[PDB]
């Protein structure tokens, strides 16, 4: 796992632990896991474009990784999709999983769509950031922002929910509203 050491106010990937004795780790407070959203990287934040990056698969257990520090998200998503017959499509959020804390917009996307897998993964391999946990799957009725987690060594509010009605979630023939 890559690590980040802030040398002279400049971040460098610590791929080798034998870098230099200049790097100091006095306490665990210097170690921090920052979860940065993908919106900063410039990816498309549109609902018809963001949902194409999410795919359903079966056989891969969900995994959750903790991150302490987060990034303010200007575009969050709240999937409440269900199967066309009314069956549940996304697993319920377990204890300790809450919505993303800071969200300028919460794209609450509801509707119907095919659910070919027990869990909804990210096609780009990124995580689904939550209140303080990063999960590889999407939980039902929980605000999340698709993002990535970085581990580094530190040196010594209103949400506007947007309603969507999606038919055919996860397919190239998808209609919104």
């Amino acid at each position, epitope marked *: 796992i890559p690590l980040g050491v802030i040398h002279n106010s400049t971040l460098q990937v610590s791929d080798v632990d034998k870098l230099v004795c200049r790097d100091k780790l006095s306490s665990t407070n210097q170690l921090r896991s920052v979860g940065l959203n993908l919106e900063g990287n410039g990816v498309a934040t549109d609902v018809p474009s963001a949902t194409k990056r999410w795919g359903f698969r079966s056989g891969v257990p969900p995994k959750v990784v903790n991150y302490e520090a987060g990034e303010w998200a200007e575009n969050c998503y709240n999937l409440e999709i269900k*199967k066309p*017959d*009314g069956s549940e499509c996304l697993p319920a959020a377990p204890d300790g999983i809450r919505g993303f804390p800071r969200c300028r917009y919460v794209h609450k996307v509801s509707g119907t769509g095919p659910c*070919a897998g027990d869990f909804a993964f990210h096609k780009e391999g990124a995580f689904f950031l939550y209140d303080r946990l990063a999960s590889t799957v999407i939980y039902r009725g929980t605000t999340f922002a698709e993002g990535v987690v970085a581990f580094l060594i530190l040196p010594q509010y209103y949400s506007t929910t947007i309603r969507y009605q999606a038919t*055919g979630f996860g*397919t*190239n*023939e998808t209609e919104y509203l």
Partner: antibody
Amino acid sequence: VQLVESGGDLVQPGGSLRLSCAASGITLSGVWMNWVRQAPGKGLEWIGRIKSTSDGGRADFAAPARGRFTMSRDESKNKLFLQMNNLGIEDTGMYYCFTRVQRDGTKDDFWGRGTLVTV
Amino acid sequence: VLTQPPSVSGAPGQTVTISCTGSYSNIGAGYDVQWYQHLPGTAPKLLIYDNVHRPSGVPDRFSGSKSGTSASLAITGLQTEDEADYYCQSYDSRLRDQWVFGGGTKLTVL
């Protein structure tokens, strides 16, 4: 858990018909209710569906029932009313009222008796 | 819009397979395919509620399998009480997620 359908009397080709679906032991507002048309000598034809009150309270209909058919729900007596405006001769057959209710990973339809409609 | 054979037949001791051809949006889109046993004079009875999963209270003889864009229903150890129309039910990615039923296969016991 059972469902019963009411209505379906003989209707002239020009007119309107009302179909009432009632259930005991299951709340219609909490589950998605589907309507299917079973014409004589013809396969099953899904016509409409109403979502639960928890989700969007809107009804989806197929192409033949796009505008002619309208669905209303009365939560007081947990009855679902299907209004069939501008009826036609092709709208003949048994109309069923069923819902996909999933419990502990297993789902059942709980089909109703089904009312026959003659035009 | 998904199609079914007009009718099927098989010996009681043999296993009868009922075909159901869909498309990229009906079955190729990942929608679950359901099978119904429509006994005459009574409401249809669900037999398979997913690609392979079967509801409780349904005999183990009825088994289903989805391959590619088509789904097949297998009836092993056929009896004389299964002579009824079998319908293939799925959903379409097009038409804004509307249920699609098959043409119906009238299984006949010889």
